[PDB]
Amino acid sequence: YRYTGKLRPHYPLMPTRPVPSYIQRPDYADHPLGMSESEQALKGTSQIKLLSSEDIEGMRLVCRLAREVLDVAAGMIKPGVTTEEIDHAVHLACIARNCYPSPLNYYNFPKSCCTSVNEVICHGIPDRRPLQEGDIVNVDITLYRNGYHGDLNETFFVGEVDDGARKLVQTTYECLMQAIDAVKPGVRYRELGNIIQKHAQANGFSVVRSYCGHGIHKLFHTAPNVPHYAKNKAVGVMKSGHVFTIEPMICEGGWQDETWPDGWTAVTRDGKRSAQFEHTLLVTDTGCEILTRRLDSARPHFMS
């Protein structure tokens, strides 16, 4: 394997972290290959769940808890902290909230959150590498509570970063918020990618194509598939009661990705930097409710 940039994995990984039996587990938690049979039973279906009030309460709770866990991770970002250490804090924070860390053993993913440094687009596996001053790093958190998953991510600065890093992260955040502003009943899922790419392109950035936003509720990833690039073939129209994510991955250079030998880590083929932000959204009548929003501060961590 020829690496695309300066990043390398730092092994060994500490042994898989257990989750006390008292915490309710998703179907895939105990599957030998971490396959989710409830998800697989809906593979290739484009029909979107309309959530009940019970479902909405469940989503509101789990998404609030997920935000709390992301905030825990935010507090730990500093030079010299390893991504495994962030993951350990995340793991314990989920457990403290009587939640299962959704990524853990999801299709055999070995950790409890994804840590995506610099050229890693998404699905970076927490390991022994200490964060370095100048790095940018995304932590993507998902929690499972009472049958419901809640999912968000933010990109962070490690110490002082360069102008390019600031522009990339700022622009990525803007793409997400411009797409969210457009969410309301009657809007086609395929429109969001038009908005996101318009803004990314205007700032000299490209939009990752291989990874998309997604339905989430009783399943971790489900209909609708939500591309972040222009002129996509996404199936569906937003309706009150739909829950899904928007999670644009944006790059300094080209949009092409490839995966490391670990089967997870997705990196820019050109080794330039990528950034991502993500919210879980509920479509209402005036627009939408940002379920994973901060409740106690106006802005994402990188501005604050």
Build a one-symbol-per-residue string for 216-255: x at contacts with ligand PVP by CB under 6 A, - elsewhere. Answer: -----x----------------------------------
Q: State the binding partner of 116 from Co ion, ligand PVP, K ion, none, CB within 5 to 8 A by kind.
A: K ion
> Does 278 count as an annotated binding residue?
yes
Give the DSSP letter of residue 33: T
> Does 123 count as an annotated binding residue?
yes
Q: Is 132 in the site for ligand PVP (CB under 6 A)?
A: no
d(CA 272, CA 197): 18
The residue within the footprint of ligand PVP, chosen from 64, 211, 240, 262 (CB under 6 A), is 211
Q: State the binding partner of 274 from ligand PVP, K ion, Co ion, none, CB within 5 to 8 A by kind.
A: K ion
Q: Quick check: 125 and 265 in contact, CB under 8 A?
A: yes
> Does 140 count as an annotated binding residue?
yes
- Closest distance to ligand PVP from the beta carbon of 61 (Å): 21
> Does 54 count as an annotated binding residue?
no
> Does 151 count as an annotated binding residue?
yes
Q: Is 277 in the site for ligand PVP (CB under 6 A)?
A: no
Cβ neighbours of residue 18 under 8 Å, at least 6 residues apart? none
The residue within the footprint of K ion, chosen from 4, 36, 115, 116 (CB under 5 A), is 116
Q: Is 83 in the site for K ion (CB under 5 A)?
A: no
Q: Is 103 in the site for ligand PVP (CB under 6 A)?
A: yes
- Rounded to 10 degrees, what is the CA torsion of 71, 227, 57, 302? 20
> Does 301 count as an annotated binding residue?
no
Per the document, the length of the chain is 304
CA dihedral for 34, 35, 37, 39, sign (positive or negative): positive
- Closest distance to ligand PVP from the beta carbon of 145 (Å): 17
CB neighbours of residue 178 within 10 Å? 16
**What are the b/e assignments for 187-212, b being 16+ CB within 10 Å?**
bebbbbbbbbbebbeeeebbbbeebb
The residue within the footprint of ligand PVP, chosen from 28, 51, 72, 106 (CB under 6 A), is 106
- Residue 152: both structure tokens together: 């968000």
- Closest distance to ligand PVP from the beta carbon of 159 (Å): 27
Q: Quick check: 122 and 140 in contact, CB under 8 A?
A: yes
- Closest distance to ligand PVP from the beta carbon of 109 (Å): 4
- Closest distance to Co ion from the beta carbon of 102 (Å): 9
- The CA-atom distances, in angstroms, between 254 and each of 1, 212, 275 are 20, 17, 13
Q: Which residues are annotated as a binding site for a protein?
A: 123, 221
Residue ranges in contact with K ion by CB under 5 A: 116, 120, 138, 274
